[PDB]
Amino acid sequence: ETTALVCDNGSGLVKAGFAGDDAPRAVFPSIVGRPRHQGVMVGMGQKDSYVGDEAQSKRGILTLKYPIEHGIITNWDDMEKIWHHTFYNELRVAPEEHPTLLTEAPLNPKANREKMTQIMFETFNVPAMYVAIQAVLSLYASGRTTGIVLDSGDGVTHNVPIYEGYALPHAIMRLDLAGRDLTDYLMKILTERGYSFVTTAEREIVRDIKEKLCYVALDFENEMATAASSSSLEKSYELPDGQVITIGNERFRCPETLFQPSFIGMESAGIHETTYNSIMKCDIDIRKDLYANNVMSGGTTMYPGIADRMQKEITALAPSTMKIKIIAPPERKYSVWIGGSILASLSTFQQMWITKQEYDEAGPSIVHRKCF
């Protein structure tokens, strides 16, 4: 028949696929590279600009830039390029054939939803579409109707509490810290050890270090005293050309900043405190069930130990008599897509798609009343 397209724009990875299957069948960075040098060789197949895995491969000669920054879309032409590449090159499926489901972070400018709909209907002619909160889909993915979600990709971190399938708007917390802007810190602490990564290609090389070798200390202070006293924590990594670099306390010290955003000079406290101060805004009758389920989602929650650091300090903040349980399946990096894949395959959801009939009647204003 016809099956929804399910897409998560994120920052960094785009991941897309058809609803009703287990995992996305395109994943690639949301990155657009334009070449900046003078090309000398003639008759080369040289091209206006590259997208996704192409620009990753050629990146030595490119300025990479990201069209999404803290879940806001900041460029529209590059964003059109990325969606165009997703549907035609990655899925090899026309948009006209399929309704589309799109993912978003909460509390961000309504112009973003307006534009994203206006594009999907006008340029693609997608027959119907819907725009959905990431945190909501993480619960579908994890099999629960109740919980507090912590979801962090690049850019935006946010908590949404959910109780028996009611949202709780006043308790939503959003935080710009996660994921991209760890790396900008990690570049600086590596500069302290006498390595300097300046260009955007070097930023991608740092990001690969961060993915490989960082981990979260159960107690930050004991582990700094240990690595100060010893080499035993120290690991070495091979840069693309074949130099080797050796990194010490910097590896645990980078993801500590999620717990102490004062390291980058943000005001707000770390994810443990905003999670707790979210639970504190819920009515007392549900807090036992929120404390009993915490779902962690998205790549920034992948670092080894982050769940067990979290449980330890929430258990310190929370009253003493209760289970704190942190639920963090190994799959969690894809949970937002998996939950979108469940959601778009439901029958009840077939009545909720915005359809072109209504957009043509109402203009893009409709998205606010029809969608969340």
Binding site: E69, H70, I72, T74, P109, D176
Partner: peptide, 7 residues
């Protein structure tokens, strides 16, 4: 963004 943050 438009005011506070850079985007």
């Amino acid at each position: 963004w438009x005011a506070x943050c850079p985007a």
